[PDB]
């Protein structure tokens with residue numbers, strides 16, 4: 001049954017169709033933000049220190065693996081604050097490590113002050129509180145509402161309810177709220193703070209992530225994946241579902257182009273960058 | 286054109302159908318929170334002081350009209366903090382007055398510090414920052430993106446995109462982020478802070494407000510109304526659209542019932558309470 005289901009028959013075609021869609025609708029190719037050796041070392045040092053109180057040891061290779069999503073999904077042309085950039089590198093990486101941990105080993109009393117220390121190092125006083133609150137909310141939500149009936153209801157009812165849940169759960173709201181200081185762009189800053197930024201980009205991020213993590217997630221009993229709403233065994237049902245999802249992505253991209261140029265660049269680089277990172281990364285194979 | 290269209294032919298039937306839906310799906314009838322004479326006095330005094338720098342003088346009757354949405358839509362069974370309650374009364378009322386003002390007269394330099402003063406009076410340090418940030422975001426969104434292509438794109442594309450804009454624009458995210466301290470309920474606090482609370486309740490709130498404000502908004506050229514997505518002149522198109530909105534509200538209500546009992550009470554009291562207030566208030570006639 002579902003615990004043994006797979007999208008493996010569709011990997012090649014779906015990858016090519018995602019890329020075809022991005023070339024047509026976004027056009028601008030993702031590029032990688034470059035960090036100097038010293039900047040990368042500072043990020044890795046900060047990640048190791050954040051996760052040290054947890055008794056967790058993590059290799060440089062694994063940190064670099066996680067950080068790629070930041071290097072690829074941010075928008076290099078628009079960056080103004082590289083201190084905020086390194087904070088997102090660190091926040092992103094330590095939250096991945098936390099998520100990959102056995103939940104029985106989550107110690108919020110040790111982890112939250114580390115998240116706060118990161119925010120306070122890299123951001124101004126105002127920004128530090130916004131980014132910390134988003135980080136605290138993400139990690140708290142994950143805990144509070146696992147094995148919750150709410151997750152089951154939202155994830156099994158309809159794509160729309162599912163994506164409503166993923167606005168927070170896939171981490172985009174947190175991403176926006178820690179990323180706006182990178183750009184110092186007034187419009188982007190407000191869209192981030194109202195969460196309209198996250199609401200516009202959630203489907204594009206989530207459909208991609210869900211496709212490439214489905215086999216692993218389903219093998220582990222995890223229900224937070226939109227492809228669980230269709231029978232991935234029936235080639236015909238799958239293809240119809242996948243096309244509806246591509247259509248969702250396209251509608252969002254087309255609406256995103258109504259935003260101001262800088263903001264639209266950042267949103268589209270995020271969705272398209274995430275896909276590039278996702279298909280190159282060992283986490284999803 | 287659409288500027289002279291009307292849903293007046295449908296008022297009685299739609300009102301009856303909304304009520305029948307709530308009686309079936311929510312069941313628990315809205316009740317009105319009691320303020321003592323002293324408490325209402327305090328609220329009105331605070332309202333007048335906030336809008337005085339704007340040269341605004343407002344009658345008790347007008348303030349009482351605005352505050353009814355708070356007295357009816359909050360959940361009296363679950364109130365724990367009446368200071369937070371009065372803060373919502375004040376914040377709600379002064380935001381109404383701001384929104385009814387000629388935009389040329391909006392003076393953020395004068396108004397924002399008044400919003401901050403209200404939050405600092407009634408909330409603890411942590412809650413004051415969350416409520417104030419949500420008020421600031423709401424009022425800043427309203428300004429920044431008032432004649433924005435984004436608003437047009439979102440409001441005209443699909444119901445989905447429209448409701449995505451209204452999460453912030455109808456003010457529910459702000460409502461949730463100023464209301465959670467009333468209840469001091471951990472789960473509700475978190476759903477408020479992640480905006481999941483707002484995402485679950487926006488369609489119920491927005492569909493009802495939109496129906497009862499359509500005629501006035503369309504006469505003023507305003508585009509923020511879901512009934513603009515159909516031809517309200519065509520009775521069969523309208524009835525089809527209306528049913529689709531009712532189905533949306535019912536789906537949200539049924540998913541809301543998967544939340545913990547206190548949270549679901551609050552969410553449902555809000556949607557149903559707003560309907561009761563909307564149908565009895567002079568603002569929509």
Ligand SMILES: CC(C)=CCC/C(C)=C/CC/C(C)=C\CC/C(C)=C/CSP(=O)(O)OP(=O)(O)O
Pocket residue numbers: 069073092095096099169170171172174175205206209210213270274
């Ligand atoms: C915000 C953004 C750029 C993209 C959306 C997805 C993504 C790669 C997020 C990482 C960036 C952020 C803010 C937080 C990390 C949280 C996390 C472990 C997300 C994975 S989504 P799932 O729970 O499905 O885990 P899996 O990776 O195993 O599929």
Ligand SMILES: CC(C)=CCC/C(C)=C/CC/C(C)=C\CC/C(C)=C\CSP(=O)(O)OP(=O)(O)O
Pocket residue numbers: 354358377380381384454455456457459460490491494495498509555559
């Ligand atoms: C936010 C909530 C719980 C319910 C929605 C109902 C409502 C009017 C709430 C006001 C309460 C809050 C937080 C803010 C005030 C915002 C405001 C003046 C109007 C929003 S509806 P539109 O912009 O269409 O104006 P109109 O009233 O003239 O139709």
Ligand SMILES: [Mg+2]
Pocket residue numbers: 209210213214217
């Ligand atoms: Mg996944």
Ligand SMILES: [Mg+2]
Pocket residue numbers: 494495498499502
């Ligand atoms: Mg209205």
